[PDB]
């Protein structure tokens, strides 16, 4: 995350880390939606242009984390995947449409002061909260800057970062890029005239873009850190996978009222 700040301990208990076994490399973020289901962006798992194709037993899921690298022996919980699901109409080639994946946990996780699931929006919450103007909150252990001077410092954070940033109107998003924006995306960030910065950046993907409802005092995951042109460029906004339009699929595959 660019232009963010350190998160406090426990402030995003649904933040999950996508950890690759070998070599041990932080691969993306993710979110806890349940004691067994974790939602991520699909291109964490499946990006053919960079020869990126993970199978359930390549990766691990570390839930409860504060520090990027430390083994938080008493707080975090480290899980294996049973099945990975990628959205059948995920378009990595052309526009990154339906950048979503679920992953089911081989065994369910115990909830604590540091592990707890976010909500998934219903129609009225999507209706009333996804508005241009309203701020969301993005967190993640991804790159702090677009590029930096090699070996003069650390370009990825020591701890989970937070940035709050507002949702831009479709037309403005649409005329910020020449890439084919679909109704399964939103873009978010500040305008150049806005005089505030922030973005997500590489390795922040799959991390949740959340909002808090003032009326029930709860948090809803509205989006998934998906793609963008560079990071923290002026007149450039970050794009997220609009979770609410993809919720019927998430229904189909959680299949809750079943076997």
């Amino acid at each position: 995350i660019v232009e963010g700040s350190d998160a406090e301990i426990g402030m995003s208990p649904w933040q999950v880390m996508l950890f690759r076994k070998s070599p041990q490399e932080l691969l993306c973020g993710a979110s806890l939606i349940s004691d067994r289901w974790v939602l991520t962006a699909a291109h964490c798992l499946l990006y053919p242009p960079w020869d990126k194709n993970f199978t359930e037993n390549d990766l691990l899921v570390r839930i409860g984390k504060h520090s990027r690298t430390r083994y938080e022996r008493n707080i975090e919980k480290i899980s294996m995947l049973e099945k990975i699901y990628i959205h059948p109409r995920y378009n990595w080639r052309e526009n990154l449409d339906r950048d979503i994946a679920l992953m089911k946990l081989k065994k369910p996780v115990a909830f604590s002061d540091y592990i707890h699931p976010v909500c998934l929006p219903d129609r009225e919450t999507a209706a009333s909260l996804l508005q241009a103007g309203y701020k969301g909150r993005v967190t993640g252990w991804g790159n702090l800057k677009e590029t930096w001077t090699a070996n003069v410092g650390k370009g990825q954070p020591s701890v989970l970062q937070v940035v709050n940033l507002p949702i831009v109107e479709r037309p403005v998003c649409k005329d910020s890029t020449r890439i084919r924006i679909t109704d399964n995306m939103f873009c978010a960030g500040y305008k150049p005239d806005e005089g505030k910065r922030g973005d997500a950046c590489e390795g922040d993907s799959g991390g949740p873009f959340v909002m808090k409802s003032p009326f029930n005092n709860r948090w809803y995951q509205m989006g998934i850190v998906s793609w963008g042109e560079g990071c923290d460029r002026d007149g450039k906004y970050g794009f997220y996978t609009h979770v609410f339009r993809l919720k019927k699929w998430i229904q189909k595959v959680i299949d809750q009222f079943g076997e």
């Binding site: 076994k21 070998s22 070599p23 041990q24 490399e25 932080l26 691990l60 570390r62 990027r68 690298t69 430390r70 083994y71 480290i78 294996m80 650390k154």
Partner: peptide, 12 residues
Amino acid sequence: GDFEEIPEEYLQ
């Protein structure tokens, strides 16, 4: 990429 321990049980 500055990572710590994790029980080898998970890295196999």
